[PDB]
Amino acid sequence: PPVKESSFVEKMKKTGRNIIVFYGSQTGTAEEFANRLSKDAHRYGMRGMSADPEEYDLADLSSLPEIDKSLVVFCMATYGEGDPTDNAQDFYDWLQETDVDLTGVKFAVFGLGNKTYEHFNAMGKYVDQRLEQLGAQRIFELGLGDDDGNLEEDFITWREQFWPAVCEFFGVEASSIRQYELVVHEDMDVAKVYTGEMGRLKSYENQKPPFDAKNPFLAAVTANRKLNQGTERHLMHLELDISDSKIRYESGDHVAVYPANDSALVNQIGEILGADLDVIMSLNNLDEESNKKHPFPCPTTYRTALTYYLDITNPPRTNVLYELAQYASEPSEQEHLHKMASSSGEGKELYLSWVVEARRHILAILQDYPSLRPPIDHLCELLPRLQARYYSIASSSKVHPNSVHICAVAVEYEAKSGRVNKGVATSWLRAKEPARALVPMFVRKSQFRLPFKSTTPVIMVGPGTGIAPFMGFIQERAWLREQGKEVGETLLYYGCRRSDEDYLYREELARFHKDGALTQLNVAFSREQAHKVYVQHLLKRDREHLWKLIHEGGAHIYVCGDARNMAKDVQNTFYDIVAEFGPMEHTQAVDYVKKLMTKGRYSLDVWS
Ligand SMILES: Cc1cc2nc3c(=O)[nH]c(=O)nc-3n(C[C@H](O)[C@H](O)[C@H](O)COP(=O)(O)OP(=O)(O)OC[C@H]3O[C@@H](n4cnc5c(N)ncnc54)[C@H](O)[C@@H]3O)c2cc1C
Ligand SMILES: NC(=O)c1ccc[n+]([C@@H]2O[C@H](COP(=O)([O-])OP(=O)(O)OC[C@H]3O[C@@H](n4cnc5c(N)ncnc54)[C@H](OP(=O)(O)O)[C@@H]3O)[C@@H](O)[C@H]2O)c1
Ligand SMILES: Cc1cc2nc3c(=O)[nH]c(=O)nc-3n(C[C@H](O)[C@H](O)[C@H](O)COP(=O)(O)O)c2cc1C
C-alpha cells in the first residue's frame, strides 16, 4: 500500500552513514531507542540514522555490505499476540517469504516486550533468528527488554555493552549536540500554523476521508455518562458519533484517540521556565537530508506542542535527564541528573525510585531540582511524542453502525512524588461535554472476534473495564437472536468490587439476561464479603459445563482486561479444567489451551 522510499543503502552512501537503526514500534518506545542508538554512533566516530521499516524495502539489506564497516540494528517491539507492530508487519511478511542471501551483513537486535504476555518478545526473537538463517552475522547478543520490570534499564544495560562490542569489532575508538535548530517566526499567516492537527495542515477543520492514524476523524461526543454507582472512582461511558466518516468497525476492534494534555500543567511548565508559550516557531532538522524535518508539526506555538504533540506526564527517560544536566546551575543537581543514565549503582537506584517509582513528570523534576532551567526549545526537542490511547470499542456495528462506544476508568492517583497524577486521555475524555465536543480518532482492526457461526458457544471473561468489548459482543449476539438467527450459548463472567459501587452496565446486563441474549450472567463481587471472589472462581465453579462447551461445543473463549495478573489466573484455571476433565497432566492441559489460541478459540484483549 505505501509507496516505499528509494534504497536506504543508497541514502547511507550519500550521507556517509554506516549504521542504520530500524524501529518496530506501536507506541513510540522502540522509535525512541532507535533514535538514541543512531545518535550514539557519532560518539564513536561513526555516523548513523534511524528509520521506519514500513517506508523502505528491506530487501536492500543485501547491498548493505557495499558500505565499509556497515551495520544494521533492529529495535523491535512485539504487539498483539506475539505479533509484529503495525509498522513492522510488512518487514515481517518479507522475512517469512524471502530467500535473499544476507552474507556480509552485520546485525544486532534489541527486542521490546513484556514477560507477562503469552509470547515474550516474539518479534525481536524472530528477526534476530531469521537474519542469521538468511546468512547475516550477529555482531551482538539479542536484547530482551522487559516492560514488566524496567525496560529503560534493560536498554541502558544492553546499550552499554553494545557500543564497546561494536567498537571492538570494527576497531574504532570513542559534548551536547542538537538535532534541530530554532527558527522564531515573526508575523506569519495563521493559515500555516499548526494548532494541534496530526497530519496535513488544517486536516482537523477540513475533514476528508479516508480517516486513520495520519488523518484522524474528529468524532462528536454524543454521550458521556458516569457508569459506576459509587464515588470511589469514576468509570465512564462515551459514545462517539462517526457518521459521514465512512469508518467501518466490528465488535472486538479498538478505537484510538489523540488527547490534549492538561492546560494548567502546560501553563506551569512555561511559567517555571520563564518562557512565552505563545511564541510561533519551528524546530528544523540540522540535517537537511532527513525526511524528518521537524520533531512535530511546525510551525506552531510551544503551548500547542506541549498540549497536543508532546508527552509531559510520563517519567522522563534517562537520556532526556542526561541532556538536561547541563542546564542545572547547582552542582549536586547537575550530578544527580547526569547519573540517571547509570547501568548500576546509586545513580540507577535514584532513577528507579525518585523518577520512575515516584512517577515524577517533567514539571515535577523542574520543581524538585530548582537549579534546572533548560531553554524551552531544547526541551521540546527532547520530549517524546504524545501517543494516542486505545479503547476497546464497547458497541456492535450491527447495532450502532454510526457510533463507537467507549468504556473507561479515569486515571487519577497519589504518586510518591507528593502530587496527584492525572491520566492524559481519560482526564481529557472525562471533561468532554455532549453540548460540539470533538474527539480526534480512528479505528484499528483487531483479531478479537465473535465466532463466524452464530451457533458457536461463547465464553467471555472480562472483570472491571475488561467488559468493554463484551458489551458490543452481547449487543450483537442479542441482535442475531432478534434477526431470527440460531444463537448458541453466550456466557459472561464479569467482576466488580460491589454491586452498589462499580457494577458497570448493570441495567443493560440485567436486560440482556432476562431476554435470553445472555445465557448466564456470572458476576464476581470481589469485596462484598471477607474473601476475594474473582471471575476464575466462577469458572472453576462451572468447570463441568465449561469443559462440555469447549470439548464438545467448540466454544470460543475470550479474555479481556488486566494482562498482569488476571489473564494468567484465568488461564491457569482453564488449565485445571482441561486437566481434570480430559483427563490429562497439567503439562498436557497447558498444550491443549495453547492450541486453542492457535486455532483461534482462545482470544485475548489484555492491557498494559
Ligand atoms: C489495546 C488496548 C485496549 C485498551 N482498552 C481499554 C478500555 O477499553 N478501557 C480502559 O479503561 N482502558 C483500556 N486501555 C488502556 C488505555 O489505552 C489507556 O492506557 C488508559 O485509559 C490510561 O490512559 P490515560 O492517558 O488516561 O493515562 P496515562 O496518562 O497514559 O497514564 C497511564 C500510566 O499511569 C500509570 N498509573 C495508572 N495508575 C497508577 C497508579 N495508581 N499508581 C502508579 N501508576 C499508575 C501507569 O504507568 C499507566 O501506564 C486499553 C489499552 C490497550 C493497549
Ligand atoms: N486502562 C485500564 O483499564 C487498565 C490498564 C492497565 C491495567 N489495568 C488493570 O486491570 C485491573 C482491573 O482494573 P479496572 O479499573 O478495570 O477494575 P478493578 O476494579 O481494579 O478490577 C476489576 C475486578 O477485578 C478483580 N481482580 C483483581 N485481581 C484479580 C485477579 N487477579 N483475577 C481476577 N480478578 C481480579 C478486582 O477485585 P479487587 O480489586 O477487589 O481485588 C475487581 O473485582 C487492574 O489491575 C488495573 O490496574 C487496567
Ligand atoms: C495490546 C498490547 C499487546 C502486547 N503484546 C505483547 C506480546 O505479545 N509480547 C511481548 O513481549 N510484549 C507485548 N506487549 C508489550 C510491548 O511489546 C512493550 O510494552 C513495548 O515496550 C512497546 O513498545 P512501543 O511503544 O515501541 O510499541 C504488548 C503491549 C500492548 C499494549
Side-chain angles (χ1 to χ4, degrees), residues 1-563 565-608:
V3 178
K4 308 285 190 177
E5 299 291 325
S6 53
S7 168
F8 65 75
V9 182
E10 281 303 308
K11 290 183 181 186
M12 286 173 87
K13 294 180 178 182
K14 301 291 179 51
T15 63
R17 305 193 198 306
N18 66 307
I19 167 172
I20 183 164
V21 187
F22 287 102
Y23 50 93
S25 181
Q26 191 61 40
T27 50
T29 318
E31 184 175 352
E32 284 293 48
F33 290 155
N35 295 324
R36 291 159 67 175
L37 290 179
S38 178
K39 289 187 177 67
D40 292 327
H42 185 83
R43 309 196 298 89
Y44 301 98
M46 304 180 128
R47 211 151 301 291
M49 66 180 272
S50 59
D52 186 334
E54 179 164 36
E55 283 178 48
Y56 298 85
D57 170 17
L58 279 293
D60 291 314
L61 276 171
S62 68
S63 299
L64 191 57
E66 297 171 12
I67 301 177
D68 298 340
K69 300 181 187 298
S70 74
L71 163 62
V72 57
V73 182
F74 296 98
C75 293
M76 314 287 288
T78 298
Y79 197 60
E81 199 308 78
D83 298 309
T85 51
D86 293 343
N87 85 309
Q89 191 64 255
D90 199 285
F91 174 45
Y92 179 73
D93 295 332
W94 177 75
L95 288 169
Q96 291 203 299
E97 71 84 16
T98 191
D99 188 64
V100 67
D101 178 62
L102 301 187
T103 295
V105 169
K106 296 294 178 289
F107 75 102
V109 177
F110 179 85
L112 283 73
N114 185 311
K115 288 202 182 74
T116 69
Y117 285 69
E118 189 65 14
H119 295 92
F120 179 52
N121 262 119
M123 186 57 171
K125 297 177 178 188
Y126 181 70
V127 170
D128 169 273
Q129 170 190 62
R130 192 60 181 161
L131 297 171
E132 172 163 63
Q133 293 182 315
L134 295 174
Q137 191 179 67
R138 189 175 300 97
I139 197 176
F140 194 63
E141 53 183 56
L142 161 73
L144 295 177
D146 178 18
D147 206 10
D148 187 54
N150 191 277
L151 178 62
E152 173 72 352
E153 287 310 321
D154 292 326
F155 180 64
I156 285 167
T157 299
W158 185 88
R159 161 168 178 272
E160 193 174 66
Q161 310 175 306
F162 176 65
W163 287 112
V166 174
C167 294
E168 196 54 37
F169 184 88
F170 294 113
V172 295
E173 238 67 3
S175 50
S176 178
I177 295 177
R178 293 209 54 186
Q179 180 167 62
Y180 302 99
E181 72 167 308
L182 171 71
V183 176
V184 183
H185 292 137
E186 291 298 305
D187 195 58
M188 177 182 218
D189 315 58
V190 302
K192 56 202 311 172
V193 171
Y194 282 86
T195 60
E197 324 96 302
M198 293 303 278
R200 210 191 197 193
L201 173 56
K202 280 293 176 294
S203 52
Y204 272 16
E205 192 179 4
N206 310 320
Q207 296 252 293
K208 185 170 179 173
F211 298 100
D212 47 57
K214 292 286 179 58
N215 178 44
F217 177 73
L218 272 63
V221 175
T222 69
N224 185 351
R225 63 194 178 81
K226 181 181 165 67
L227 274 170
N228 55 314
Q229 302 73 11
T231 55
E232 286 305 294
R233 308 145 86 211
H234 184 79
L235 285 87
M236 54 196 180
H237 171 82
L238 291 96
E239 297 178 359
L240 310 192
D241 179 354
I242 59 166
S243 300
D244 307 317
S245 78
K246 297 184 174 299
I247 294 172
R248 299 196 176 193
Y249 80 90
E250 286 299 307
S251 303
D253 288 332
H254 297 130
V255 51
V257 307
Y258 289 107
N261 282 307
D262 171 285
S263 64
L265 186 67
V266 169
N267 287 312
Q268 290 192 297
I269 288 172
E271 187 200 318
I272 202 171
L273 296 173
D276 182 340
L277 297 182
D278 292 303
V279 174
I280 295 179
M281 63 74 229
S282 307
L283 281 169
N284 308 326
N285 201 325
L286 282 173
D287 172 344
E288 293 166 293
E289 290 298 1
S290 180
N291 288 301
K292 195 181 184 153
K293 279 298 190 299
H294 316 296
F296 46 74
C298 289
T300 183
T301 60
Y302 292 119
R303 191 181 299 285
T304 292
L306 292 161
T307 306
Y308 304 96
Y309 304 137
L310 306 172
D311 171 359
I312 65 190
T313 51
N314 291 318
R317 303 273 174 177
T318 66
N319 67 301
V320 175
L321 302 176
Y322 190 95
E323 290 288 326
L324 290 173
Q326 69 186 299
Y327 302 117
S329 59
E330 177 61 41
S332 63
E333 287 185 4
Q334 178 180 190
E335 193 69 52
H336 285 306
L337 296 162
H338 182 77
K339 283 178 181 167
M340 301 291 200
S342 293
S343 71
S344 71
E346 76 77 43
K348 175 171 175 177
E349 305 176 319
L350 182 59
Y351 178 67
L352 292 183
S353 65
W354 198 74
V355 176
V356 190
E357 184 60 37
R359 300 295 304 177
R360 285 189 160 74
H361 37 58
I362 184 60
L363 178 58
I365 290 173
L366 285 174
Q367 297 174 323
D368 296 347
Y369 279 165
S371 79
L372 178 63
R373 295 321 179 204
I376 184 69
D377 60 297
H378 196 177
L379 181 56
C380 284
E381 155 175 338
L382 297 169
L383 300 167
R385 292 299 306 281
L386 180 62
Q387 304 295 304
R389 271 64 168 156
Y390 298 100
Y391 292 94
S392 305
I393 310 186
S395 57
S396 166
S397 51
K398 300 291 183 178
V399 180
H400 296 273
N402 296 297
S403 193
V404 172
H405 294 187
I406 290 178
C407 172
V409 53
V411 175
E412 180 171 9
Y413 57 98
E414 318 162 318
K416 305 274 285 289
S417 69
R419 45 277 266 185
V420 180
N421 284 349
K422 301 289 243 65
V424 183
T426 52
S427 292
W428 175 67
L429 283 173
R430 179 184 191 174
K432 292 298 185 176
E433 300 180 69
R436 307 163 311 308
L438 298 167
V439 167
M441 52 69 81
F442 61 93
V443 163
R444 174 184 180 278
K445 188 170 294 179
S446 83
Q447 295 181 55
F448 205 75
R449 289 279 182 294
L450 274 163
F452 290 103
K453 288 180 180 181
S454 69
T455 53
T456 306
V458 170
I459 303 172
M460 314 171 281
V461 186
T465 65
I467 191 176
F470 301 139
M471 290 313 299
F473 271 33
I474 293 163
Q475 301 172 340
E476 191 158 313
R477 295 275 279 194
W479 180 75
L480 287 170
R481 285 171 78 256
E482 295 167 3
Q483 292 305 98
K485 291 296 177 180
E486 182 191 320
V487 187
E489 287 184 55
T490 303
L491 295 60
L492 173 64
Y493 286 81
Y494 170 63
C496 59
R497 306 182 180 184
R498 294 195 166 82
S499 68
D500 73 329
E501 173 75 38
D502 52 22
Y503 190 153
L504 310 176
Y505 299 106
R506 189 175 62 196
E507 295 63 53
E508 291 87 338
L509 290 169
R511 168 96 301 171
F512 288 122
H513 189 193
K514 181 191 304 303
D515 298 339
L518 262 188
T519 306
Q520 274 184 30
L521 178 51
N522 300 312
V523 179
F525 299 111
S526 73
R527 307 183 183 180
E528 284 182 357
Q529 59 292 289
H531 58 288
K532 293 298 187 179
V533 175
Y534 294 142
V535 289
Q536 56 272 38
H537 294 148
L538 299 198
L539 303 174
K540 178 64 177 189
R541 174 201 70 186
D542 304 332
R543 54 185 184 299
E544 187 284 303
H545 186 55
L546 292 183
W547 168 248
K548 180 249 186 51
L549 294 183
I550 296 168
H551 185 69
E552 293 171 355
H556 282 214
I557 296 172
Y558 304 80
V559 176
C560 176
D562 171 56
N565 284 98
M566 183 281 286
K568 293 173 177 183
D569 282 347
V570 164
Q571 200 165 302
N572 284 298
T573 293
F574 277 119
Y575 296 153
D576 300 339
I577 293 179
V578 171
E580 165 174 2
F581 298 80
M584 60 178 89
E585 274 300 302
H586 179 74
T587 301
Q588 269 60 66
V590 173
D591 284 321
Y592 186 108
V593 165
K594 282 173 167 51
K595 187 183 174 186
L596 287 178
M597 301 184 164
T598 64
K599 294 300 180 177
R601 296 178 54 217
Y602 192 121
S603 310
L604 298 150
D605 183 18
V606 290
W607 326 317
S608 66

